[PDB]
């Protein structure tokens, strides 16, 4: 009995691997990797940071780092600036909708890794009110854990996409 | 609570926060602890994903290749343990796809498994040998929820991405695994984020700006193809189900 | 060695060794054996259909399913042989201990 | 600084002074400071009485017991003829009541030929 | 509105006369069927949020439902929505019970019988036993206790607006002789007017249905009531106990009467204390400023007899102690066979503190706080500075407990702690 059942189990895994995987893989299409930002920015090296979908909305909000490609004829220009352009793409065909506006970073916030920024949905503003309403060791002015711990930036970037906005948080990883 | 982390549950006003002893859960309204998930090293956790369809469960991904899921409403109790054969995990997403098989006259594919009575199990306690109704090892976290009125069977898809090589692994129902080989292995670009549009349609976003789309639409639009996936899953379990009672 | 204490244990161990053995063969193996063969036949039909519906050039061989089908048929026939045999074992078991008592 | 006391609301707890897990009624098994099953309020509504035998009972418990034909006027715990202890302020209000019941039962026993 | 907007056009389309009565009646029946369907879908928000503003609609809905299938569909849809949303442990328990009782009163108005109430109750109670703090807060809601007592021993915030709202809902109470016999025998008997009950219209009984036994309920009522009498009875709780007594007696287990008896005794204890004190003041010319309460120790569950720590033998001021001893002696004379023990830890004294600057402060303080402050009473107007060790020896109070008592007077601005010695603040350099 033990031999016969194990005889079926090893043969059963063969059916799944040899045949079922063959059929399932066929009904599954993988789109080739494509560049969409090239049309809008063909002379810049593109660095991508984060992108999420707004619920009940068919638009893709993305955060990109745009660094213009410096040709071999312009020597050592100080325009090697990392620009955190924010745009929108329709979810299906990834089509650009609104003209990107470069967010001006204040000089005090230049000492943070912009690449580590992640998207945080679902009413981040609620915690801001509750932090001051709870007698915790957390102070809001910047949300700071006491006077002796790491400081993390909560960039409530008001990207007005058709009247709605998302929320961002800038983690601290000092360079 | 100050932290650059925390992901809010889309369906319920709860968040998942990270503290030293483990993953912690607090209510937004009361700031009161609800559950604690014991985790050893944060660096091992590739990412954590919430349940989009229900929000009752929570998914945790390990870099070694292990997936562990804990129910939030059960005070952080572990409910299921998953393993994927020899896979390096970079970032995983959990998606639940609800099937809608409306009755159609052109579909004469009647079912007889429902008419046949459901099986049982033999489990022996200290006092005596007892008989209990049969439940699939993974049915506890997949059973039709009491709180879910729309009890339509829910497809469970775990999507896995491998680091350093950009290999895509899709995992169905907790047992069956399917491997898909990507052609674009020339560049080792780290995947930045994974975004879900609807059920079975996913976009992957790498560091270089390239966009990769994974679509399960053809699979979900074919009634027989999903049945093939379901059938191969039932056969493997019952053979082991028999082997359990044989020993 | 045997005595009264082990004799009752011998009958109790022996009786459960057979009457519980017959239950698990009929209430588990028989319904399960039917269900595996049921699913494999539906398993065979589906792959055959897309071999025709798709008309895809590459085909997946069905020799793997038939082996499971014949093997599954073998187990169910083999299960029933044991169940009848354990029935005879029960008859032999009782007649021995009634005299051994 | 001068402290003037305007009003004092003090709380006192009263207990039975018994001339010495055994402050229970031998009949109803309720605490002396509690009520027997037939009374609602402790104290005057359920007073305690002490016998010459130094056996303690609820007024109602021992009266009812003594009123049964089977008691023969004897203490239920020790079987001596139940008479209230003299000189205890607690018994003064009940002496007449208990003399009448014991005398009545003694006369009935003489009539019943036992 | 639909008729005036479309019925003429529809009649022209069909060609039937405009005054077709049966078609209009069928249209009206379909409208009411659609209204029932929409309300069944939306009943959760109707009962949870829109109540009691939508209560009128409920009365309209009650006129329409007629079949058992309607009630079953209604209750199952409501239970699914209530269970989907409210039974979440992530929801605060106070708001959960508030919305729950709102649905109870809403459904009671909709269904006078209350059978649907039993079904929802039977389905939902295990979720109530799942939550731990429900019992404490609900009885405290039952007795309308002040938030200060709530905040003393409960470690999670409770919404005061929710508390007042549930209190308002709880107190809501909207839920010639021989010739008349011939006429009323004829008018009343010939005029044809064409699991237990557990469906009482009282919401407080439904709240009581949580407990497997009302024994714990009445015991805690006793405990809180004993605390109040010790704090001083408010008229508001007399209504509460009246409701408690009224329902229990109607039902009538052995322990239930045990905790049903002395609530009357405690009332009798205070009533006799009010009566005995007047008699005591008449006979012995006792000081009319002392109002003693004579309590039955067994029934007030005051554990005088924790036999383990020698920590409450504090000395009362000699003048007050002598007067209180006079009361004990007279009591033994009036009630022979009884001994009186002073609960030195229980009781309140109203004291007036007069300072050199003319400030008079009147406070209600415990007997312990009065003993501490009395140590600083200077008959000769000399500044009394006492160290912690001197006060502990004089008052026989342990130093940790004395610090808490001294902190009370520091918070009230009476005492100042300088370099380990406590002195009276005689001259406040700040506008009171
Ligand atoms: Zn009595
Ligand atoms: Zn005696
Ligand atoms: Zn008694």
Curated annotation (Swiss-Prot), chain A:
It is found in: Cytoplasm; Nucleus. Keywords: Cell cycle, Cell division, Cytoplasm, Mitosis, Nucleus, Ubl conjugation pathway. It comes from the Eukaryota. Coiled coil: none annotated. Present with 1332 molecules/cell in log phase SD medium. Component of the anaphase promoting complex/cyclosome (APC/C), a cell cycle-regulated E3 ubiquitin-protein ligase complex that controls progression through mitosis and the G1 phase of the cell cycle. The APC/C is thought to confer substrate specificity and, in the presence of ubiquitin-conjugating E2 enzymes, it catalyzes the formation of protein-ubiquitin conjugates that are subsequently degraded by the 26S proteasome. This is Anaphase-promoting complex subunit 4. The lineage of its organism: Eukaryota, Fungi, Dikarya, Ascomycota, Saccharomycotina.
Curated annotation (Swiss-Prot), chain C:
It is found in: Cytoplasm; Nucleus. It comes from the Eukaryota. Component of the anaphase promoting complex/cyclosome (APC/C), a cell cycle-regulated E3 ubiquitin-protein ligase complex that controls progression through mitosis and the G1 phase of the cell cycle. The APC/C is thought to confer substrate specificity and, in the presence of ubiquitin-conjugating E2 enzymes, it catalyzes the formation of protein-ubiquitin conjugates that are subsequently degraded by the 26S proteasome. The APC/C is composed of at least 13 subunits that stay tightly associated throughout the cell cycle: APC1, APC2, APC4, APC5, APC9, APC11, CDC16, CDC23, CDC26, CDC27, DOC1, MND2 and SWM1. Present with 1332 molecules/cell in log phase SD medium. This is Anaphase-promoting complex subunit 4. It comes from Saccharomyces cerevisiae (strain ATCC 204508 / S288c) (Baker's yeast). The lineage of its organism: Eukaryota, Fungi, Dikarya, Ascomycota, Saccharomycotina. The chain holds residues 302 to 402 of 652 of the full protein.
Curated annotation (Swiss-Prot), chain D:
Keywords: Cell cycle, Cell division, Ligase, Metal-binding, Mitosis, Ubl conjugation pathway, Zinc, Zinc-finger. One of its GO terms (cellular component) is anaphase-promoting complex. Pathway: Protein modification; protein ubiquitination. Its EC number is 6.3.2.-. Changing residue 65 to A: Loss of function. It comes from the Eukaryota. Signal peptide: none annotated. The keyword Metal-binding applies. GO terms for biological process: anaphase-promoting complex-dependent catabolic process; cell division; positive regulation of mitotic metaphase/anaphase transition; protein ubiquitination; regulation of meiotic cell cycle; regulation of mitotic cell cycle; ubiquitin-dependent protein catabolic process. Disulfide bonds: none annotated. A zinc finger (RING-type) spans 36-79. One of its GO terms (molecular function) is ubiquitin protein ligase activity. The keyword Metal-binding applies. Probably catalytic subunit of the anaphase promoting complex/cyclosome (APC/C), a cell cycle-regulated E3 ubiquitin-protein ligase complex that controls progression through mitosis and the G1 phase of the cell cycle. The APC/C is thought to confer substrate specificity and, in the presence of ubiquitin-conjugating E2 enzymes, it catalyzes the formation of protein-ubiquitin conjugates that are subsequently degraded by the 26S proteasome. The APC/C is composed of at least 13 subunits that stay tightly associated throughout the cell cycle: APC1, APC2, APC4, APC5, APC9, APC11, CDC16, CDC23, CDC26, CDC27, DOC1, MND2 and SWM1. Present with 377 molecules/cell in log phase SD medium. This is Anaphase-promoting complex subunit 11.
From Swiss-Prot, chain E:
One of its GO terms (molecular function) is ubiquitin protein ligase binding. It is found in: Cytoplasm; Nucleus. Keywords: Cell cycle, Cell division, Cytoplasm, Mitosis, Nucleus, Ubl conjugation pathway. The keyword Phosphoprotein does not apply. One of its GO terms (cellular component) is cytoplasm. GO terms for biological process: anaphase-promoting complex-dependent catabolic process; exit from mitosis; metaphase/anaphase transition of mitotic cell cycle; positive regulation of mitotic actomyosin contractile ring contraction; protein K11-linked ubiquitination; protein ubiquitination; regulation of meiotic cell cycle; regulation of mitotic cell cycle. The keyword Cell cycle applies. Pathway: Protein modification; protein ubiquitination. Its main location: cytoplasm. Belongs to the cullin family. The APC/C is composed of at least 13 subunits that stay tightly associated throughout the cell cycle: APC1, APC2, APC4, APC5, APC9, APC11, CDC16, CDC23, CDC26, CDC27, DOC1, MND2 and SWM1. APC2 interacts directly with APC11 thereby anchoring APC11 to the core complex. Component of the anaphase promoting complex/cyclosome (APC/C), a cell cycle-regulated E3 ubiquitin-protein ligase complex that controls progression through mitosis and the G1 phase of the cell cycle. The APC/C is thought to confer substrate specificity and, in the presence of ubiquitin-conjugating E2 enzymes, it catalyzes the formation of protein-ubiquitin conjugates that are subsequently degraded by the 26S proteasome.
């Amino acid at each position: 009995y033990r031999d016969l059942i194990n005889s079926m189990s090893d043969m059963e895994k063969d059916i799944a691997q040899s045949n079922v995987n063959s059929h399932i893989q066929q009904h599954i299409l993988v789109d080739l990797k494509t560049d969409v930002f090239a049309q809008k920015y063909p002379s810049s090296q593109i660095n991508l940071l984060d992108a999420i979908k707004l619920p009940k909305h068919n638009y893709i909000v993305y955060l990109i780092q745009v660094t213009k490609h410096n040709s071999a004829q312009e020597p050592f220009s100080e325009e090697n600036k990392k620009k955190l352009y924010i745009g929108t793409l329709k979810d299906e065909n990834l089509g650009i909708i609104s003209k990107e506006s470069s967010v001006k970073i204040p000089a005090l916030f230049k000492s943070y890794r912009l690449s580590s920024t992640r998207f945080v949905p679902n009413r981040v503003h609620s915690l801001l009110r509750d932090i001051g309403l709870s007698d915790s060791n957390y102070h809001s002015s910047y949300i700071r854990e006491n006077r002796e711990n790491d400081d993390f930036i909560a960039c409530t970037a008001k990207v007005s996409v058709d009247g709605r906005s998302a929320s961002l948080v800038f983690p601290k990883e000092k360079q | 609570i100050n932290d650059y982390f925390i992901d809010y549950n889309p369906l319920f006003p709860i968040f998942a926060t990270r503290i030293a002893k483990g993953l912690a859960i607090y209510r937004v309204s009361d700031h009161a602890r609800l559950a604690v998930i014991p985790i050893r090293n944060i660096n091992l956790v590739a990412n954590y994903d919430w349940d989009t369809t229900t929000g009752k469960f929570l998914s945790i991904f390990f870099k070694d290749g292990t997936i562990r899921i804990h129910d939030i409403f059960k005070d952080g109790r572990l409910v299921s343990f998953l393993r994927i054969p020899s896979t390096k995990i970079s970032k995983g997403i959990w998606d639940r796809i609800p099937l809608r098989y409306e009755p159609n006259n052109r579909d004469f594919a009647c079912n007889i498994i429902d008419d046949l009575p459901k099986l049982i199990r033999f489990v022996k306690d200290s006092k005596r040998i007892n008989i209990v109704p049969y439940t699939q090892p993974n049915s506890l976290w997949r059973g039709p929820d009491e709180d879910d009125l729309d009890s339509n069977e829910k497809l469970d898809v775990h999507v896995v991405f491998n680091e350093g090589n950009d290999k895509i692994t899709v995992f169905f129902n907790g047992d069956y695994a399917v491997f898909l080989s990507v052609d674009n292995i020339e560049n080792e670009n780290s995947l930045k984020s994974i975004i879900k549009v609807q059920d079975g349609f996913y976009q992957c976003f790498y560091e270089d700006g390239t966009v990769q789309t994974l679509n399960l639409g053809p699979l979900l639009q074919s009634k027989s193809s999903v049945n093939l996936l379901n059938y191969i899953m039932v056969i493997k379990e019952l053979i082991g189900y028999m082997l359990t009672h044989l020993e | 060695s045997v005595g009264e204490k082990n004799f009752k244990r011998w009958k109790y161990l022996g009786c459960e060794a057979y009457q519980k053995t017959v239950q698990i063969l009929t209430l588990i193996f028989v319904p399960a054996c039917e269900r595996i063969i049921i699913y494999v036949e539906k398993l065979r039909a589906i792959l055959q259909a897309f071999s025709i519906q798709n008309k895809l050039s590459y085909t997946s061989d069905l020799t793997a399913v038939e082996v499971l089908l014949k093997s599954s048929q073998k187990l169910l026939t083999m299960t029933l042989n044991s169940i009848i045999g354990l029935g005879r074992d029960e008859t032999l078991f009782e007649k021995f201990f009634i005299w051994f008592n | 600084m001068k402290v003037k006391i305007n009003e004092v609301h003090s709380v006192f707890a009263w207990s039975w002074h018994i001339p010495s897990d055994e402050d229970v009624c031998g009949i109803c098994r309720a605490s002396y400071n509690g009520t027997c099953p037939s009374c609602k309020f402790p104290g005057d509504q359920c007073p305690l009485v002490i016998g010459l035998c130094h056996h303690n009972f609820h007024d109602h418990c021992i009266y009812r017991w003594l009123d049964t034909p089977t008691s023969k006027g004897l203490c239920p715990m020790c079987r001596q003829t139940f008479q209230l202890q003299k000189g205890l302020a607690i018994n003064d209000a009940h002496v007449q009541k208990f003399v009448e019941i014991v005398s009545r039962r003694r006369e009935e026993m003489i009539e019943e030929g036992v | 509105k639909f008729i005036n907007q479309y019925w003429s056009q529809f009649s022209k389309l069909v060609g039937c006369p405009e005054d077709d009565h049966e078609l209009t009646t069928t249209v009206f029946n379909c409208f009411e069927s659609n209204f029932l369907r929409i309300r069944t879908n939306e009943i959760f928000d109707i009962c949870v949020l829109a109540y009691p503003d939508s209560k009128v609609t409920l009365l309209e809905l009650r006129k329409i439902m007629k079949d058992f299938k309607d009630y079953t569909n209604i209750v199952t849809t409501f239970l699914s929505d209530f269970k989907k949303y409210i039974l979440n442990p992530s929801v605060t328990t106070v708001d959960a019970l508030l919305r729950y009782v709102k649905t109870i009163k809403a459904f009671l108005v909709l269904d006078p019988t209350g059978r649907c109430l039993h079904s929802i109750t039977t389905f939902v109670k295990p979720y109530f036993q799942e939550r731990k703090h429900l019992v404490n807060v609900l009885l405290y809601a039952m007795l309308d206790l002040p938030e200060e007592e709530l905040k003393e021993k409960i470690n999670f915030n409770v919404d005061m607006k929710a508390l007042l709202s549930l209190v308002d809902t709880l107190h809501d109470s909207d839920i010639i002789r021989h010739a008349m016999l011939y006429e009323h025998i004829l008018n009343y008997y010939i005029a044809w007017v064409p699991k237990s009950s557990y469906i009482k219209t009282n919401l407080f009984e439904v709240l009581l249905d949580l407990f497997e036994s009302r024994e714990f309920f009445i015991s805690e009522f006793r405990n809180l009531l004993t605390d109040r009498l010790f704090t001083l009875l408010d008229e508001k709780w007399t209504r509460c106990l009246k409701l408690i007594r009224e329902k229990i007696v109607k039902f009538t287990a052995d322990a239930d009467q045990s905790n049903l008896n002395s609530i009357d005794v405690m009332l009798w204890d205070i009533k006799c204390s009010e009566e005995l004190c007047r008699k005591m003041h008449e006979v012995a010319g006792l000081d009319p400023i002392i109002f003693p309460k004579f309590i039955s120790l067994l029934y007030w569950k005051y554990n005088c007899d924790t036999q383990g720590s020698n920590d409450l033998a504090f000395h009362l001021p000699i003048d007050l102690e002598r007067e209180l001893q006079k009361y004990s002696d007279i009591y033994s004379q009036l009630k022979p066979g009884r001994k009186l023990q002073l609960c030195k830890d229980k009781g309140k004294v109203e004291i007036q503190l007069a300072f050199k600057d003319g400030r008079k402060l009147v406070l209600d303080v415990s007997l312990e706080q009065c003993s501490v402050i009395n140590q600083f009473d200077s008959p000769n107007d000399e500044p009394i500075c006492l160290s912690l060790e001197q006060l502990s020896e004089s008052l026989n109070i342990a130093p940790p407990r004395l610090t808490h008592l001294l902190d009370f007077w520091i918070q009230k601005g009476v005492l100042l702690k300088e370099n380990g010695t406590y002195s009276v603040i005689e001259h406040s350099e700040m506008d009171f």
